[PDB]
Structure formats: C-alpha cells, structure tokens
From Swiss-Prot:
Keywords: Ribonucleoprotein, Ribosomal protein
Gene Ontology molecular function: any one: zinc ion binding
Family: Belongs to the universal ribosomal protein uS2 family.
Residues of the full protein shown: 9 to 121 of 241
Modified residues (N6-succinyllysine): K107
Entry function: Required for ribosomal protein bS1 (rpsA) to bind to the 30S subunit.
Domain of life, per lineage: Bacteria
GO cellular component, one term: cytoplasm
Protein name: Small ribosomal subunit protein uS2
Subunit structure: Part of the 30S ribosomal subunit, contacts bS1. Some nascent polypeptide chains are able to cross-link to this protein in situ. In collided ribosomes contacts ribosome rescue factor SmrB.
One biological process term in Gene Ontology: ribosomal small subunit assembly
Length: 113
RNA sequence: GGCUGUCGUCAGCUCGUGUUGUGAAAUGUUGGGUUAAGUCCCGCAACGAGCGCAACCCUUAUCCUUUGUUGCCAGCGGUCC
C-alpha cells in the first residue's frame, strides 16, 4: 500500500475531530495519519483528476506559504495546468470577471517589459 | 438661480464587482511602518474605480539659444566729463 515513502503527518493536539476516520495516530504527543487510507484515496482522487484532464480541463494549483511556493511553480508549471504560489487574491475565482482585467494589465506590461 | 464665506488646502468622501450578516450594514477605506497627504511600502476577502492629494499653470533663483532700440559701454578714438 504505502507507495508514499515519507509524510507521516504532523500537528499534535491542535487537531480536528472531523479527521478521526483517516487517523491511526498517537505518538510522542502527536498524531500519525493512516497508511491504508492515504493510499486508497488516490482511488477516487487521481481517477477523476486524470479524466477531466483527458476531457481538456484547466487545473490550477494552490499553495501559498514560502515553504512550497516555487515548489508549485514546477511540473504544475509544465502542463496545461496553472498555479498560485503567493497571495490568494480574494475573489480571483468568484469575482473572476473583475480580477480578469488585472491580468489584462500584466499582459500589457510584459508585452513591453 | 448665480455668486460668496466657513470648517479647510484640512485628508478626507464614495461607487462597481465579490465576499460576510436574516437585516440596518460591513469589507475595500482596519492593521505594521512611512509621508505635507487615503503619500507610498508591506499586509489583508477583497479586486478595481471616481472626486480629492500630487502632477500639468504662473512666478522666483542658475545657465543656454535667438534678439538688439527707446535698453547696454567692455576694448577702440574725441571730448563743451
Ligand atoms: Mg488615491
Ligand atoms: Mg493638485
């Protein structure tokens, strides 16, 4: 099952009871995730993800925090998928129809940079 | 009506969209700095915009080009200086 070498799942008491099923944990006053449930989760996850992908679908990666920021400007910045590695501008998706023309500007700047 | 004084040349006053709240409303315009300034930077469920601040206007301080009378006299002669 564990095709995933090393990511035992941090965070100690600061937990969330909604996250009981996916837990086997209890070590050194901190939770351990679950082998036999992390792996099964690709099941519904990589299945649908690589299907909508086949149907030609935009992806968009999201990962703020300067601890994996350019680590998403990566093989996510390789395919027809996209990314957000910094500040998530509130409403860039629900208010897309406004934020869109902040892009139109970016374009005008790099189109003369 | 038009025009004017006043707070005050104070740094303020608002809207679109989005989002939050049953709602009046909120956010943006909190906050950390910074500035003469809602000035700017960072931040941030906000993203942007309008009036305002600033700039564009005039004048003042240095220089340059063009211009030389009614303005000017440095080097030239003459002197009723
Ligand atoms: Mg302004
Ligand atoms: Mg002005």
């Amino acid at each position: 099952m564990l095709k995933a070498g090393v990511h035992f799942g941090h965070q100690t008491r600061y937990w969330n009871p909604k996250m009981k099923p996916f837990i086997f944990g209890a070590r050194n006053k901190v939770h351990i995730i679950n082998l036999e449930k992390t792996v099964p989760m690709f099941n519904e996850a990589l299945a649908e993800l690589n299907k909508i992908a086949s149907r030609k679908g935009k992806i968009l990666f999201v990962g703020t925090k300067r601890a994996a920021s350019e680590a998403v400007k990566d093989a996510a910045l390789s395919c027809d998928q996209f990314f957000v590695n910094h500040r998530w501008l509130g409403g860039m998706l629900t208010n897309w129809k406004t934020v869109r023309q902040s892009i139109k500007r970016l374009k005008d700047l790099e189109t003369q940079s």
